Amino acid sequence: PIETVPVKLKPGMDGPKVKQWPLTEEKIKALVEICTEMEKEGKISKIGPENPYNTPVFAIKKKDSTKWRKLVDFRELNKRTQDFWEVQLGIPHPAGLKKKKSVTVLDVGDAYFSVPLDEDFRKYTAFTIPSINNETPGIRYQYNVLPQGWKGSPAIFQSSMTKILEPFKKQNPDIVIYQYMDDLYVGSDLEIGQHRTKIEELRQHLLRWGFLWMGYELHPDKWTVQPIVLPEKDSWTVNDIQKLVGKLNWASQIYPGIKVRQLSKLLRGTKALTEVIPLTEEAELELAENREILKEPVHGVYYDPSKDLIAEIQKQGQGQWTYQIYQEPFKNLKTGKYARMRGAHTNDVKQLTEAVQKITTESIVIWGKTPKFKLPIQKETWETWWTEYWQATWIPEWEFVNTPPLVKLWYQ
Template identity: 30%
Template sequence: MVNNQMQPMGALQPGFPNLNMIPKDHKLLVVDIKDCFFSIPLAPADRQRFAFTLPVLNNAQPTERYQWVVLPQGMRNSPTLCQHFVNLALKPFRQRHLEVICCHYMDDILVAAQDISMELLKDLTSALTDFGLCIAPDKVQQTLPMLYLGHKLTQQAAIPVVPQLSFPARLRLVDLQQLLGHLNWIKNYLNLPTSTLSPLFSALQGHKLPGEVIPVTEEMLQALQQVNALLRDRMVDRIDTLHNVQLSLAIFSTPLLPTAILYSQKSAAPSGVSIVEWIHLPHTPPRNIYSSPAAVMDLPAKVLAKMFKIPIAQARDIVSQCSTCSKARTMIPFDAVNPRGTSPLAVWQMDVTHTPLLAPFSKVHLTVDTSSGFIWATPLKGETARHVIQHTLRCFAVMGKPQSIKTDNGPAYISSQFSSFCDLWNVKLIHGLPFNSTGQAIVERAHLTFKTLLSKQLGGRNAPSAEIPSIVHTVLFTLNHLLYPHNREYTPAEIHFRKAEPLARPLVSYRQLPDPTWHGPVPLISWGRGYAAVDLDGRPTWLPARCVRPWRASASEVKAATSHTSPSLADVAFLQP
């Protein structure tokens, strides 16, 4: 109960001291504090918080109630308080002997000096006694080799004491985790690059239960054999002296990740250097720092050329060298022949698709504005009317409120609950023809585009649950703010949210098959690859692109035809076949 209410204080020391930084010409003394936890008193005001009751068999007599008066073992902050209390006890000793190296971790103390006399030991004992701490007489070590914090101290080096490592008959996840814990502890003393241990760390992937059996591969056996071979050799040295010591850092380009050594050149070692510590990067970095959008998302050549002001040929070379970007081209879902809105927020298409990459949020509700191409997606656990309404509200918050929403005939979309929701928001709800997927072609293409970019972003792996929102938002940012649809000079976000006055509409001639007669002139509303929309009696009429062509007339006819509309554009060369 106390641990549940107690705020963790955290460790006061981030790790063990490097014992190879103790010079070879120093003598050593190792002591251990006897019953350290039970020698640290609790504050009288806090003792009542650590009261406990001893039960009695069959309630035959009254129970006895006690309270801790010393630091209890098992309390969350007991190790931190122990470190702090012992440090307070050693502080006067350190101040009186500035030339002495005094290391301590919990209740283990190491003293190193040019000469360790009985007076120094008595002074250390007196400093601890003043705080109620006592040295265990049977734990005092004054001759080499010594044992301290799992290390064996010799005249030449301090090395960890590790038994021969091996796999059990049935390797469980907890066994592999314990083995890797030992390796993480000893790798700073060995020439053990991260690439050597990569098969062992990679075996952790895909396993969650502690008792889950992990198959042992040949690569794992070879890695463990190499570790055992390295344990037979000493690969570190204690520094010679603290006087004018110069430590250097050397970095080597090893496979997978670089390796470094901390060494001293003033050494009598046969190699001419004394290696104090091996430095290896973790197999999985704790965090990634990105300085470029290209490191976060996959950018096509046109975006690279525009963002970094480089030639398009150079941008294509960069994209072709990327193993992810060159796998598949990202298609922008704005070229299908499908009725669409003539302005942002006119017509939305909405649908739901499934992707196991985002499990358990595998039901991705997706909405696309049929005019601007702006896409918004919400990964959810279901596809009921409640989930559809939740996704629609998020779209309203990001994209605005549309005039109409077009969906298929799924149960959630034709439900009375969603219909009432649309009526409440004054949004017209339109359903396509049953079993006709072409009516939802724009959003179906958006599904493919979203999944393609999501697969690139994840590299084929499943997304961790905690990272799903950030991954989905990264994909949406790429689609809406970085990619340029076919024959457009602006991104979907720029088209969707821009407030500039629309350009004047050019005049065109048109024909409606099977009638071969050309009519016109009429204003052109929209045009794309394979489709066009013209203004007939104030309403958009969608036609195949081959049924629309520039209207050629005299200047007087153009002026008369456009007196009730916006001035026509003089340059309509983009409609030329």
């Protein structure tokens, strides 16, 4: 690949100028070693002071690997980079991916370092290895090849990728293969034995076309909108019925036909919260009629690819996290729950960071893009710590929730 594909920023926009955040000494040392080798291999070059641009970098460790890895936060550059209609008018996001029994995630970002980047665009990929205590100027580099995590890389490489896969695709017509950024998602409907074989067959096939040896395995079979469930009790207190009417009142914003009049009737008076209230027949029927309403899907829910996806997360305690993905309020496209996050029984922020990555991965499989997160955390706590637990080569956008939502109760 000697020819470079011309690339430009969007009209009237300069390159990114994002401050490098401070790094620990061990991460700086890891980045110096990594970048020295990338420089020896021609992937990056030192730049001079006439380049004013900057993109943050940091260092991580992928899922159960001990080698440090460089991660560039290209969020700013990606939004300043021209929209890409790469080889065609677009890749129709494969709606069958989310239906496969198993989906394996393969890191193919290594392929990008064999394709040269347009010489006039390289300056915009500038990044800095920072010094400790400002004691030296940072080490300044720019990319000479397609960088991992940049929006342009999958698009500019897509012609090559389709050819690398065609022989495999030819023999395996029933396997769905989808690329998002640095990752390949490989879905099929056969047992892991033949699935892992196919996966290992795919990576060997890739190794002969010019890797990583690692993979992730998903089961999009299960992803849906979880139903609203109501309690089934033989004795209801005043408090129980108040919680029930509150939850139903919330559900009536989502579902038509929900009624609470006969349930509220039971609370006639000014009763102790712990007093047991017998259900009347009218209230039982109304509750049953609400249960029936809640068995059906919500009315008028559809994905619009022109709108952002929004993901909300609630901390439920004891390592459990609930989340909802939507574009308009009360029109959930997907909801779910996470428990016993691995390796962080005593660290809320690690658990939240892992939930964010899992939810982003589900969003990529279902829609081909990442949601904007509403995170139940103070900004300063999140921004001090999330990079410590990040293991993905993409990074979504997020905002912070500072007022506790009442809805946490309803997804409880």
